[PDB]
Amino acid sequence: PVDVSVSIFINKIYGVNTLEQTYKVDGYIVAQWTGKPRKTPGDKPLIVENTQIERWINNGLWVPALEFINVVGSPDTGNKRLMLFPDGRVIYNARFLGSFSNDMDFRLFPFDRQQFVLELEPFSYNNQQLRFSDIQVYTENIDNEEIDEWWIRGKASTHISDIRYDHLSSVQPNQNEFSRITVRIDAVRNPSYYLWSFILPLGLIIAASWSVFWLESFSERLQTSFTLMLTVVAYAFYTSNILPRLPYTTVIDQMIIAGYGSIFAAILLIIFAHHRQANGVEDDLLIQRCRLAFPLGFLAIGCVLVI
Amino acid sequence: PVDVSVSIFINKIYGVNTLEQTYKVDGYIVAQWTGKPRKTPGDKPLIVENTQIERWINNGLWVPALEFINVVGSPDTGNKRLMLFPDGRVIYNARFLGSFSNDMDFRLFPFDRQQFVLELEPFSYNNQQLRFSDIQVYTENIDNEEIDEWWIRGKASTHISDIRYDHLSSVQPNQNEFSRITVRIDAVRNPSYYLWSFILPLGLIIAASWSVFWLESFSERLQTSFTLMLTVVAYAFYTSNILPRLPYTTVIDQMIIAGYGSIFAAILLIIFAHHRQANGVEDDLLIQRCRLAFPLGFLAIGCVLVI
Amino acid sequence: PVDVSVSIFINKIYGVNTLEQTYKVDGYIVAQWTGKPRKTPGDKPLIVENTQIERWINNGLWVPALEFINVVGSPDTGNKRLMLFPDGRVIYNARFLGSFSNDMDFRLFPFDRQQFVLELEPFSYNNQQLRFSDIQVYTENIDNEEIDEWWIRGKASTHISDIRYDHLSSVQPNQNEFSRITVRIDAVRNPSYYLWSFILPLGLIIAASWSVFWLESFSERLQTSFTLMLTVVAYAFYTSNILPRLPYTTVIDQMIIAGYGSIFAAILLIIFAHHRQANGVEDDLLIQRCRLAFPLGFLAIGCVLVI
Amino acid sequence: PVDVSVSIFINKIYGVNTLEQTYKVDGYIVAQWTGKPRKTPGDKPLIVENTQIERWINNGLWVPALEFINVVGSPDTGNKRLMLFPDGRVIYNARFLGSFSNDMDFRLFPFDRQQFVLELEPFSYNNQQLRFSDIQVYTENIDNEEIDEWWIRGKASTHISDIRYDHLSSVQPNQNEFSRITVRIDAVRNPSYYLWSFILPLGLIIAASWSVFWLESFSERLQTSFTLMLTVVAYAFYTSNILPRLPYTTVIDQMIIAGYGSIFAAILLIIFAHHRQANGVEDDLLIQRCRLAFPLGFLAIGCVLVI
Amino acid sequence: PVDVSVSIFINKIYGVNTLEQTYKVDGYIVAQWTGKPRKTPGDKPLIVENTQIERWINNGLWVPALEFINVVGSPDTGNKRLMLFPDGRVIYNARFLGSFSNDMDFRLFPFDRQQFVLELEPFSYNNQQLRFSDIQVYTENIDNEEIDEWWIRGKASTHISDIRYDHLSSVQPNQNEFSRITVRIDAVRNPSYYLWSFILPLGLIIAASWSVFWLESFSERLQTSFTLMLTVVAYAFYTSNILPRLPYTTVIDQMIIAGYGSIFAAILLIIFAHHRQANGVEDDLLIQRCRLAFPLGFLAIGCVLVI
């Protein structure tokens, strides 16, 4: 087995796609291994760039294809370099920009943690193995964080391992184990924007919705909630058109549903007060004064949103 | 005829496009067949990656083109591999990401079932036939389902068959039958998000629309429905801007239409009550109290939405 | 002149772009012609796939470039095949996905008819002519129509002809006529979704707008139309954000404008009634009761929308 | 210097992008020049298509690269053709689709004039010059204009000239002048859709906003303008979401701002009338009757929108 | 070390993407260096265009790959040119369109300053160094500025330097320093559109929100703020759907939040006035007349938005 050492430099992690559960990574990859020594011009190592690499491979230079197990589509690679040493060893250097996949849970929306992952594994060779993995994620931990969308809690953690494929080729003696590098980078979302521009106003609006009980008339109390209704709908619109699309409800999504319910419960009470009596217009003076039953009956149902 | 055995590994099914009736599939394809034995370095099978395959084909290596009958556009293929065995046999291994087409009915929207399909068939050869088909869909049935948009029912069902082309080339003796593999994967949509964030509020809103009859005045009853009107419009907007575009009405779409109608029917009654009398302001005390005729006259018309 | 026979198989017509007046077509193209006989391995016709075709052309195999006169950009071509016959003849088979252009009138919007068109013409040769054209549009007429956006009237109509180019090269003897195949496929839009989700509610809303005249007060009548105003605006928004963009007004667009006008005319009358009198608050009892002058004065102006 | 004659056929001008100031052009380019005579099979001129051209260039055929000075990105080129004449001359024919840049002023929005421009100039050669330029813009002036977004004045105006580059290579004797063809096509926007669907309703809405002064009460007059406010906001939304994005205000944009102001001025007057008195509820009978001071005080400030 | 002189011509800086912190740059790059003299046809320098450059590199012509350290993805390069001089020197000329990355702070939104940056560094060679950098940004400072989105303060400032890479290859003697050119161009945003179409109306709206205190009734005062609420929400929607997406709050964003708060504070006061008394309907005549406490209590909290 050939010992291949891998170094991965990560430049930029961006463009998360919530629906597809993908994210974009720009970086370099470096692979080193040793082959039989060679005569290089002078005795300085030889440099082979881009189009020329192909030529050396035709004359039988071994350059194993390393696959990103979890790229969606084939990465855009920039410059490629072979550094051929006279003492045999070989260094492959290439820049890449790729879309990568991972299981991503967005349920705690505005405050969710996520992990960006790279998985490197040789495409054709079970033989030849990964010596060691190094991830130079030379961004910076707690710096421009508030200028950037995601806060990195790395550095990156690595993990070389062996993957067994059951249903393999017609090869069987013992060629079903491939060497796999797995990089993980942890991150949390920058919850600021969503608190101040979504959670907050949603609160104010839901709260204000409660001030319907301090209206004198019944005709006032009822007609007004039809406007609070329209308000939550507009806010749902605004909220859902700007927030990331998902197949499940988020924190915010539930708040909105709550607002919908609070306002509908009120309409039930408001109408009940007016007809649970012993006359015609005896609004249960006590009930129509649940101007406290709601606010904290909602901050009770609102502390079971987090049970 | 050459016996070609195909194995298809399916990594990710994502990005459904409702309007175009397409979906994205990332995976590997493996084809094996046997040709006349060969001298391979050592006697170990020979590996040929990417750019080199082209070269071997120039020297007359037969590698038949296998077409995805139902890809829209040409798939993005990652790494290619030929494994050449000394005892003759040949294995072709390639990664692919492609957009695939299928008839898709989205009429039951939030709770629709769908089937993702691959169709493999040789591009040029009626001769050479498909030995057997294997689909390793190594995701997992009922696991992270609630993190993912689609729930897979699978495993995949396969189907080798023969397709006859009537209008063919100038070849006629009997060369109009092609071997076609057909993979099918079943799935249902994750109806959660749509129930709690769309169906529910739409219900509340339509229900609340009925509380218009518990308004004392007529001026109150009528003026208020103009707001309920605006509310349904807003909700239609919200609904249609976030939901997948289609050329037909869905479940939700009908609910919306229903809301439109309920509110328009009420406006008719509300105005009729006020002028079907024997004076000037004799609102049919009985009629203006169809505060039950509607809710269940709608839950009757609402059980014929599902007849 | 060489006799070239063309067969075009059409798989999918999708992705109409209203603004650019383009549509997407996926299919195969087949060209056959006869050249000087050849020695083929065995005496079975020879198959040449993809990359190899290029090689044969280098050794002087004539394969004339057939251009799609009306593609926007250059088509994505999948697999290519040369079938070389020993008795001379040659068959070119290629899959294609392209964006095609045609004059498209969308003025009758929800119920417009359109025609999808292919135009094939040799790129360099006025010599060599198109023998006959066959379009196998093996979809199905009136079948899944209600699952699909467009209903095909077809089958396709063909028409081989000669195009004369005035301003041509320095060639003049008589080399300005090119053989052009022209395929046409007719289609109508699936007007369902738009009737039930747009035309209908727009009607209800415009109608309901008329119930403003059945309000008792003047303050009621006027203040309320400001809400009907806002409603039409919201509906315009909803309507225009979901409907296809165009540089002209459609049917629906006019309805919307009508709604705008009806509501503005009403505001004029409502205010006129209140001040065309002999006192201060003598609303022309007769006029404020044009609760029929509008509905049918609009179904009169609404039958001149179709004159 | 070689005399190169250029002819440019323009098929389609579409996809204007207001923000980037770019537009899309599909067409053919034709270049002709004369080199030393050649032996062509027969004595008929020779045709060389696509992939073959590259080969002839390897054997030392001179084919100068003509650059589109103002393409954004590199054009998608379809078929290429070399027509090699026995008497020396050479014709290069290629189809192209590119995105082109030009200074574009969109300030008169719905009625702006624009000019679509091509700029052709040899990439490497100051030597060799452009003989003459011909632009066959065979669309049609005033024909389907109302089906198309842009109305072409044209025909196209050409202009061959010499561009001097100051900071040039290490070459200095006098090699800093390049031959540049510059095509211009004039066009005006199809202002229909925007008049009837935007300018008009905006008018109606702004007008109707004035009918607030014909409300009897003060509570009526004030509360109602808060709805007119909301209406303008909605109309701004509708307007800005459908109109082309720009970094400056358009005609329409100003109307909107006007509506905003009129409504705010009214709220000032309405409130002023109610408190500029000698009691408590003495609304300046005269002032509250500026039901004419506004409409024409706005058609005065509205004729200084065009000073 | 080889002395490489670089000149960069910048044609267009466009398409800023706020979320990804990237911008688009179209331009030319020119590299010059000197190698061993050569025999050129005649003694005129030799020109080598596009496809041919590749050939010369195969015969061992050294053309070092210069990487844009900060491109996202790999640039689209148009025409390439080698100018080979007989006296040895070599000039490389290429057009490029690329997406470039930089730290971008958008917190002062409508009036933010930004800097567009290019970073050029040899891909493989620590040897060979950058002689001098020249950026010809031949646009124009304060000219068509009001037609363009961004105003350039330039001209461009350069900075050639040495970057040390710690974790490098197996090379160690002293080969960890690479020559890096860094270009910077300064710019400010054209704040017009946003002042007149966003900041202004937002002001009017927030101001008008204060006129709620000039309402006579309490039922009037409270019911009306529910409409002002809905208005701010609609404006938030309009605002956020048209403005650039970011992970933080901007100036405008805060104004919006302020409007939300002002309107909520008012609802608190309005309700407090009505129940802080010695009876039932004694609205603190003094308090309900904070028609000045707010406007300037907000222009006080509004001058701490800028502390």
- DSSP sequence for B162-225: EEE-SS--S--SS--EEEEEEEEEEEEE--HHHIIIIIHHHHHHHHHGGGGGG-SSHHHHHHHH
The Cα of E187 is separated from the nearest Cα of chain D by a number of Å equal to 15
Residues A24 and B97: their CA atoms lie apart, in Å, by: 17
* Measured CA distances, A249 to A16, A204, B291 (Å): 18, 21, 34
CA D258 – CA D253 distance, rounded (Å): 9
What are the C-alpha distances in Å from D112 to residues A155, A228, D14, D22, E36?
A: 55, 43, 16, 15, 58
**In this structure, is the dihedral angle defined by the CA atoms of residues D215, D218, D223 and D227, taken in order, positive or negative?**
positive
Query: Hey, which bits of C137-278 come out as E strands?
Result: 150-152, 161-164, 177-189
From B9, which residue of chain A is nearest by alpha-carbon distance? A167
Amino acid at C164: R
Give the whole-angstrom CA distance, residue D73 versus residue E14: 12
> Which positions in chain B touch C230 (Cβ < 8 Å)?
230
Residue C234, min C-alpha distance to chain D (Å): 7
Distance CA D57, CA D84 (A): 12
Q: Is C60 left (phi over 0), alpha (psi -120 to 50) or beta?
A: left
Of C20, C171, C226, the CB nearest to D227: C226
E-contacting chains (≥3 CB pairs under 8 Å): A, D
* Interchain CB distance below 8 Å, D207 and C264: yes
CA distance D161 to D174: 17
Chain A CB contacts of B52 under 8 Å are 57-58
User: What is the nearest CA distance from C140 to chain D, expressed in angstroms?
Assistant: 31
Chain A contact probe: residue of E20, E105, E107, E233 with most A CBs at under 10 A? E233
Q: How many helices (H) and strands (E) does chain D have?
A: 6, 11
C191-307 folds as: Methane Monooxygenase Hydroxylase; Chain G, domain 1 (1.20.58)
**Alpha carbons B228 and B263: distance in angstroms, whole number:** 7
Nearest to E21 by CA among A78, A12, A109: A12
The beta strands (E) that lie in E19-74 are given as 22-34, 46-49, 66-68
What is the CA angle D59-D61-D62, rounded to 5?
A: 140
Report how far residue E18's alpha carbon sits from residue E23's, in angstroms, rounded to the nearest whole number: 9
For residues B35 and B88, the answer to whether their CB atoms sit within 8 Å is yes
Question: Quick check: D220 and C219 CB within 8 A?
Answer: yes
Tell me the technique behind this structure: X-ray
- Distance from C-alpha of B179 to C-alpha of B164, rounded to nearest angstrom: 9
Tokens of A266: 């009120």
Which of D169, D237, D245 lies at the smallest CB-CB distance from E83? Answer: D169
d(CA C215, nearest CA chain B) in Å: 7
Is residue A232 a contact partner of residue A264, using CB atoms and an 8 Å limit? no
| Residue A232 and residue A260 in contact, taking contact as beta carbons nearer than 8 Å | yes
* Number of neighbours of residue C35 by Cβ within 10 angstroms: 13
Give me the count of residues in chain A.
307
b/e per residue B39-48 (b: at least 16 CB within 10 A): eeeeeebbbb
Across the interface, do D83 and C169 touch by the CB < 8 Å criterion? yes
CB contact under 8 A, A7 and E167: yes
- What angle do the packed helices A218-242 and A251-275 form, to 10 degrees? 170
Segment holding D199, helix H or strand E: none
Instruction: Determine the residue type at D294.
Output: F
Residues of chain B with C-beta less than 8 angstroms from the C-beta of C85: 170
Cα–Cα distance for residue pair B257/B253, rounded to 1 Å: 6
Answer yes or no: are the C-beta atoms of C237 and D241 closer than 8 Å.
yes
Mind telling me how many Å the CA of B216 is from chain A's nearest CA? 7
Mutate to test the interface with C, among D34, D139, D147 (most CBs of C within 10 A): D147
Residue with tokens 């008929």: D44
Question: DSSP labels for D71-121?
Answer: BSS--EEEEEEEEE-TTSEEEEEEEEEEEEE-----TTGGG-EEEEEEEEE
Contact C193 B229 (CB under 8 A): no
Considering only the beta carbons, identify the residue of C21, C64, C229 that sits closest to D208.
C229
Task: Calculate the CA dihedral of residues B221, B223, B229, B235 and round it to 10 degrees.
Answer: -90
How many Å lie between the alpha carbon of D176 and the closest alpha carbon of chain E? 14
Cα separation, B288 vs B213, in Å, equals 6
Closest CA to E263 of A211, B101, D45: A211
Measured in angstroms, the CA of D106 and the nearest CA of chain E are apart by 8
Which residues in chain D have their CB less than 8 angstroms from residue E211's CB?
222, 267, 271
**Closest partner CB to A72 (pick from B12, B50, B51):** B12
Burial class (CB in 10 A: 0-12, 13-18, 19+), D39: exposed
Contacts across the C-D interface (CB distance below 8 Å): 139
What are the C-alpha distances in Å from D264 to residues A254, D186, D258, E201, E261?
A: 37, 41, 10, 10, 21
Q: Is the peptide bond before D155 cis (omega within 30 degrees of 0)?
A: yes
CB C29 within 8 A of CB C2: no
Q: Do D49 and C222 touch (CB under 8 A)?
A: no
Q: Which of A59, A137, A238 should one mutate to test binding to chain E, selecting the residue with the greatest count of E CBs within 10 A?
A: A238
CATH architecture assignment, domain B1-190: Distorted Sandwich (2.70)
**Which residues from B are below 8 Å from C205, CB to CB?**
229, 233
For B222, the closest of C15, C89, C215 (CB atoms) is C215
Residues of E in contact with A201 (CB under 8 A): 233, 236, 257, 260
Give the list of residues 6+ apart from residue C228 with CB closer than 8 angstroms, or none. B226, C208, C209, C212, C263, C266
Which tokens sit at A239?
């909220």
**Of D253, D30, D238, whose CA–CA distance to D132 is shortest?**
D30
Q: Where are the domains of chain E?
A: 1-190, 191-307
Are the C-beta atoms of B72 and B20 separated by less than 8 Å?
Answer: yes
D140 backbone dihedrals φ, ψ, rounded to 5°: -150, 135
Minimal CA–CA distance to E79: which of D21, C75, D121?
A: D121
Q: Do chains B and D touch (3 or more CB pairs under 8 A)?
A: no
User: Structure tokens of B189?
Assistant: 């949509």
Task: Name, in order, each residue with C-beta under 8 angstroms of A290's C-beta and a sequence gap of 6 or more.
Answer: A213, A269, A297
**Distance from C-alpha of E237 to C-alpha of D230, rounded to nearest angstrom:** 12
How far apart are alpha carbons D154 and E283 in whole angstroms? 72
Give CA D240 to chain center in angstroms: 18
Q: Which residues contact A40 (CB under 8 A, 6 or more apart)?
A: A46, A84, A85, A86
How many Å apart are CA C67 and CA D28, to the nearest integer?
12
CB contact under 8 A, A147 and E226: no
What is the secondary structure of D107-139 as a DSSP string?
Answer: TTGGG-EEEEEEEEEESS-SSSEEEEEEEE--S
8 Å CB contact between B181 and B117? no
D101: tokens are 């840049």
The alpha-helical segments, DSSP class H, found in chain E are 51-58, 192-194, 200-208, 218-242, 251-273, 293-301
Strands, E, within chain A: which ranges? 3-17, 22-34, 46-49, 66-68, 76-84, 89-101, 113-122, 129-136, 150-152, 160-164, 177-189
Residue B7: closest CA among B160, B144, B125, B212: B160
Number of other CB atoms surrounding residue E50 within 10 Å: 19
E241 chain-D contacts, CB cut-off 8 A: 237, 241
Residue of B nearest to C221 (CA): B223
Q: Are D24 and D118 in contact (CB under 8 A)?
A: no
> Using an 8 Å Cβ cutoff, are E10 and E25 in contact?
yes
Please report residues of A whose CB lies closer than 8 A to that of B53.
Answer: none
Residues of chain A contacting E20 with CB distance shorter than 8 Å: 14-15
- C16: three-class secondary structure by DSSP: strand
Distance CA E87, CA E36 (A): 8
Q: How far is the alpha carbon of C171 from chain B, nearest alpha carbon, in Å?
A: 36
Cα angle value B201/B204/B209 (rounded, 5°): 125
Cα-only R_g, chain D: 30
- Nearest Cβ partner for A57 among B51, B79, B215: B51
* D116 contacts D154 by C-beta, under 8 angstroms: no
Place of tokens 């609760």: C291
Under 8 Å between Cβ of E98 and E71: yes
The residue among D29, D216, D223 with the most chain C CBs within 10 A of its CB, best to mutate, is D216
Asked whether E194 and E271 are in contact (CB, 8 A), the reply is no
Q: Chain D contacts of C109, Cβ < 8 Å?
A: none
Pairing of strands A150-152, B22-34: unpaired
With contacts defined as CB-CB under 8 Å, which chain A residues touch E58?
52, 55
- Top residue of E7, E10, E14, E74 to mutate, by most chain D CBs within 10 Å, is E14
CB E84 within 8 A of CB E32: no
Q: How far is E174 from chain D (nearest CA, A)?
A: 33
Contacts of B46 (CB under 8 A, 6+ apart): B38, B40, B82, B83, B84, B85
Say if the Cβ atoms of D196 and C103 lie within 8 Å: no
For residue E226, the chain A residues in CB contact (below 8 A) are 208, 224, 227-228, 231
Q: Which residues of B touch C226 (CB under 8 A)?
A: none
For tokens 């004419």, what's the residue? D292
Contacts of E225 in chain D (CB under 8 A): none
Chains that touch B (3 or more CB pairs under 8 A): A, C
What gap in Å lies between CA E61 and CA E84, rounded to an integer? 10
Give the integer Cα–Cα distance in Å for E294 and A44: 77
CB A227 within 8 A of CB A205: no
Closest CA to A202 of A239, A176, A147: A239
Closest CA to D64 of D121, D26, D115: D121
Q: Compute the distance between CA of residue A259 and CA of residue B205 in angstroms, rounded to an integer.
A: 12
CB of E270 closer than 8 Å to CB of E132: no
